[PDB]
């Protein structure tokens, strides 16, 4: 059997035969013989004498595999590693290394001998290879030392002492041009990141700094530079606390920006339609720093350098800064949005550059801004659209043409419904002309997406184009079933046409879609059975929209579709099959939409769907969050099918159940899965996602989501987790200025309490007791954003409790301190909302606070008034300014309604009227309308002289209300994000009271109201 492969190893004239004999011979070792001494001593002899190194190593590896199953071996190798003869040392170390590579358990008995050996051989003056092998061995030694129950303090100290030597080996390998061993040493430093700190000592920041010096050194070979960039990226994922402690964020960012500024192959960039350059890895480093660190450490340095780089004579620096921003936004979208006053002009400057690489860089930046800040970018369509079209018309490179189309796509998709209509017809004609001219399927795919995005924005305004578009696009979805002979891009073009035709079905509704429903639906049911994961994905996306369009009429298709979806969700995902991951995401969304659009006919599928999804939560690689989200979607469907109307639940702790036993059982199922995926959960994205789902369901259906029958086990578990997140002590945080991801975790943790306060009302006070001091403390954070979240959350909690809140005076006095002393205008703005509410709910004497609070509210008004003077150029400030006007006026109206005779009206009413109508936060109209009803009913002198301004304000309000009603009827199905916020009236009752008021006012002032066209329409 095997011992012949050893004979071949020693003896062939062909060295490549001895080598591959050994490569196979190792494989054989596991699967007896009296004389096994012959094969050891033969191998040891060959390992140290063969002429070529590859044949030496081959014998060495066989010795080791033998080594697992000889008390003299390790002692003899430790002796050989200290031989006077450098080649004998090297081959012994290699064999020791191969032994460590077998993970034999008894190697743990030699930690000290290995530490003492390697402290020596790491600096072997005669063989760089021996130093590199010593570094490589140390990885196994550190792992061995961390298997002790308590890490030996002496091992850690010795091992830490070796770290500077490894750095020397690295410099040695770079100096000597030995890039094979440079790579291996970088693997060693990467392994240091994972180590317990007592093994690595204080070093890690210094390893980062040393890696940065290599990365920016253009004299170093590029592949070594990528290793270095990659190491720092890896340190962001595993050791960000050390990066923060050294405050290296800005140095990392600036180093990466310099590498990305190096020139690149321009013609490749402009034509290649497809990660290992220094320039590309540098962008990935920026991208990861933006996700990992607070924006002061990454985005702020970038925006500081935007002026000088964007004007540089070096086009690669103009290109570099735009691409830097393009990769900043995903990790720091809020900070990026706040810098739009600088960033948008910069993208416009970039589009006007003479160099195409800079123009492409600007386009990539815009695509990235649209993806993350959707409608916020589309507001600038008036500058962008002319520029982007001109680039499409005059493009000389395919990659510019693609990204121009894709930028146009992202803008058009989120254009305001009113504005798209001015563009819709000229746009429609241009995109179909483009579609004809271009024959590349990569380019056609991007044009089809832009067309569908027109439909999405236009809603019912798309009807004139619906039949021509489908006629045309039906050409790209022939022979769906036949995938043999199609390129990946041909598949994408087919898939995108299915997706965007179904999006047109969302724009025009079921009646206008009636012509094509059957052929298109049949075509999509072909897609689902096909062997393209991309094509199946587009089938499910098509079905998801059909569910929105046809509601319960789509139920006859359930028997057919669900079996396909279950099959899609159960597929093996492995070398992670990205196409299957996308398909599963969309199939889960299809299942959710079908469940919410079938109602009673999705009752046979509820239990099987929960079992399939629960299996994915437990076992899937990237579908956990979505699988769990879909489970709550199934619950939402079951609760709606039981005619629990959204927001109509009984408040307070439920002593039993307001839901029938079948529904409660479905709820409890998902409630258990939710809490098991937050308890001890290490991924913050998973925690964020669970908290978001729980808040949403609590908001819609009440406390029955978290508790029933007086048993608060899960409620207390939830609050425990949330409280821990607020304190920074949850498993997902314990692997300052916070990253935005970290800020989201805070926001959604606070929002659990917000939702519970509205669920519980008075009942919440006992739950709130533990979190209340922490939230009051977060209101004082050195971080402005944390203060903004906390003050905002306390105010919503106050709204949740209302007049059943036992802490009004404590909370009132805390928000008054924020209102009075906080340096941030936006924090003071958020506080003024909470202050008015607490006064509205208070039942004790507040006469002592009215005068100081009014003074502070007026100062806040004055700082916002000054900012309002220079903001034709900065919408982030304009939103804060406008929200301050709404909140302060709302709070003042609340104060007057609560205690009119403590507020001197003579100056307050005019200050109120000067900030009406509002531009945002229309919910604050509610106290103001009630105030106007009271002042006019008492014929108050102050408002009576102000009747023109008051009827003028309602003229704006009612015009806005009519636009809102029209926008709602025209819009594309399923765009109900902003529904509550666009409303001018919080209730039909307050709306009708206002109409009667305008009726009276028309009886006085000799028909002042009728004179106005808008109100004449409402008054009659």
Numbering used by the authors: 40 to 70, 76 to 113, 120 to 324, 331 to 630, 657 to 817, 829 to 1113
Q: What did the published study say regarding this structure?
A:
Kap123, the most abundant karyopherin in budding yeast, functions as a primary transporter for the H3:H4/Asf1 complex, whereas Kap121 acts as a secondary transporter. Kap proteins share the common structural motif of helical tandem HEAT (Huntingtin, elongation factor 3 (EF3), protein phosphatase 2A (PP2A), and the yeast kinase TOR1) repeats with a right-handed superhelical solenoid structure. Here, we report crystal structures of full-length Kluyveromyces lactis (Kl) Kap123 alone and in complex with NLS peptides of H3 and H4. We identify that there are two spatially separated lysine-binding pockets within Kap123 that specifically interact with H3- and H4-NLSs.
The crystal structure of full length Kl Kap123 was determined using the single-wavelength anomalous diffraction (SAD) method and refined at 2.35 Å resolution with a crystallographic R value of 20.99% and a free R value of 23.49%. Crystals contain two copies of full-length Kl Kap123 per asymmetric unit. The first HEAT repeat (residues 1–39), an intra-loop of repeat 8 (residues 325–329), repeat 15 (residues 631–656) and repeat 18 (residues 818–828) are disordered in the final structure. The overall architecture of Kl Kap123 is similar to other known karyopherin structures, excepting repeat 23. The unique extra-long helix of repeat 23 is conserved in budding yeasts, such as Saccharomyces cerevisiae and K. lactis, and establishes an intra-molecular interaction with repeats 12–14 using electrostatic and hydrogen bond interactions. This interaction may further stabilize the superhelical architecture of Kl Kap123. However, the dynamic behavior of Kap123 is thought to be restricted owing to intramolecular interactions between repeats 12 and 14 and the extended helix of the repeat 23. This extended helix restricts the distance in-between two lysine-binding pockets.
